[PDB]
């Protein structure tokens, strides 16, 4: 320690900037303060980071236990634990996967044991159409009409990667039903409480996303009409294709920025592809000291 400085946005405004962060020398109290900032301000932007893939993973290890993405075509060639979103060929070759996350989601929401913190280290940044959209789903919950809160009290949601699973080079010439069935076998839909208590802040989080949440079920386990999910998506801002809804936060960044955010509370998505500008980003996803929620 001796130089890390966190500047939190005032009041209820989302976000914080962190200057002078060096993951190799930060103290234990520094890391604890940074983590408190992530859980309360939801997005911490580390400034002036110039890291190799190896150093990026080491930074993530300061915060928690990294997990490699379960489909290895997304993995960085040198560091299995880095997820690569890229549409810039490297010597003509495709590294990682292009056009990822073009839908509202929380990371690993379709898995039984989602990690609590996501780190994004942008490498190639669109000049004009840059940034990632975010919605804080605890704040979104609080802003729901009281009756809508009542309607989802006691319900459960099913989450699945089945809509957005990407065809892999190995899948060419396979019948489509075989892949559909493989996805159900490898990543069966996961049931979660529709709302859960955030272990670090105590706040109630509405844990749904247009991208991964495929059904809602009652406190007896019987499916409810998906019109309820549409009304929740609509109320929380996830159906607004203009991205002007009051819940929506556009997070921009510049070279050297490294975003760390609360993957319990937030959902995020890429912007519309309104320009041909490329994107390359490295992702590290870590488990912190608690499960997603205490029922996991």
Ligand X SMILES: C[N+](C)(C)CCO
The site partner of 235 among Cl ion, ligand X, Zn ion, none (C-beta below 5 to 8 Å per kind) is none
- Answer with the entry of ligand X, Zn ion, Cl ion, none that 20 interacts with (C-beta below 5 to 8 A by kind): none
- Min CB(180)–Zn ion separation in Å: 23
Cβ proximity to Zn ion, 81 vs 107, nearer residue: 107
Sort residue 96 into left (φ over 0), alpha (ψ -120 to 50) or beta: left
Interface residue list for ligand X (CB under 6 A): 100-101, 105, 161, 164-166
Residue 210 found at the interface with Zn ion (CB under 5 A): no
State which residue, 68 or 144, has the beta carbon closest to Cl ion: 68
Report if residue 107 touches Zn ion, rule: CB under 5 A: yes
Name which of 2 and 169 has its Cβ closer to ligand X: 169
116 binds, among Cl ion, ligand X, Zn ion, none (CB under 5 to 8 A by kind): none
17 vs 165, which CB is nearer to Cl ion? 165
Give the footprint of Cl ion on this chain (CB under 5 A): 107-108
Taking the complex as a whole, the smallest distance from the CB of residue 48 to ligand X amounts, in Å, to 27
What's the min distance (Å) between Cβ of 161 and Cl ion? Answer: 8
User: In the bound complex, what is the minimum distance in angstroms from residue 198's beta carbon to Cl ion?
Assistant: 19
Instruction: Residue 272: name its binding partner from Cl ion, Zn ion, ligand X, none (Cβ under 5 to 8 Å by kind).
Output: none
Q: How far is the CB of 147 from ligand X (least distance, A)?
A: 32
**DSSP per position, the chain:** --S-EEEEPSTT---EEEES--TTT--HHHHHHHHHHHHHHSEEEE-S----HHHHHHHHHHHSEE---SSGGGB-SS-TT-EEEE-S-BTTBPPSBSS---S-B-TTTTSSS--SEEEEEEEE--SSS--EEEEEHHHHHHTS-HHHHHHHTT-EEEE-STTTPPP-GGGTTS-HHHHHHHHHHHS--EEEESEEE-TTT--EEE---TTTEEEEE-TTSPEEPTHHHHHHHHHHTTT-TT--STTEEEE---TT-EEEEETTTEEEEEPP--S----EEEEEEEE-SS-SSTT-
Residue 101 interacts with Zn ion (CB under 5 A): yes or no = yes
Please identify, using beta-carbon distances, which residue of 7 and 165 lies nearer to Cl ion.
165
Q: Decide whether 67 or 107 has the Cβ nearer to Zn ion.
A: 107
Q: How far is the CB of 67 from ligand X (least distance, A)?
A: 12
Q: Cβ of residue 27: shortest distance to ligand X, in angstroms?
A: 33
Q: Toward ligand X, which CB reaches closer, 3 or 272? A: 272
| Residue 92 CB neighbour total at 10 angstroms | 5
Say if residue 28 is exposed, middle or buried (CB neighbours under 10 Å; 0-12, 13-18, 19+): exposed
């Amino acid at each position: 320690e001796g130089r890390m400085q966190i500047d939190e946005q005032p009041g209820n405004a989302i976000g914080a900037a962190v200057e002078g962060f060096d993951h190799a020398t930060a103290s234990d109290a520094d890391i604890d303060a940074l983590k408190s900032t992530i859980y309360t301000k939801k997005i911490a932007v580390l400034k002036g980071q110039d890291l190799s893939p190896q150093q990026f993973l080491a930074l993530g290890k300061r915060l928690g236990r990294p997990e490699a993405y379960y489909e290895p075509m997304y993995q960085h060639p040198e560091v299995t634990e880095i997820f690569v979103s890229s549409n810039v060929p490297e010597n003509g070759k495709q590294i990682g996967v292009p056009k990822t996350g073009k839908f509202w989601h929380a990371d690993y929401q379709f898995m039984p044991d989602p990690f609590g913190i996501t780190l994004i280290y942008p490498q190639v940044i669109p000049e004009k159409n840059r940034g990632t959209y975010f919605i804080d789903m605890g704040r979104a919950y609080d802003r729901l009409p009281e009756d809508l809160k009542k309607e989802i009290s006691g319900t459960y949601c099913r989450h699945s990667v089945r809509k957005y699973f990407k065809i892999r080079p190995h899948d060419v010439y396979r019948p489509i039903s075989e892949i559909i069935e493989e996805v159900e076998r490898k990543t069966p839909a996961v049931v979660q409480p529709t709302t859960f208590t955030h272990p670090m802040t105590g706040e109630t989080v509405l844990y749904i996303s247009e991208g991964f949440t495929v059904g809602i079920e009652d406190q007896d386990g019987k499916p409810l009409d998906e019109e309820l999910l549409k009304r929740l998506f609509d109320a929380t801002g996830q159906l607004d294709e203009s991205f002007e809804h009051d819940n929506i936060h556009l997070q921009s960044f510049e070279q050297g920025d490294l975003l760390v955010w609360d993957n319990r509370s937030l959902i995020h998505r890429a912007r519309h592809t309104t320009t041909p500008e490329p994107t390359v980003s490295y992702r590290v996803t870590v488990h912190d000291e608690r499960k997603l929620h205490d029922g996991i």
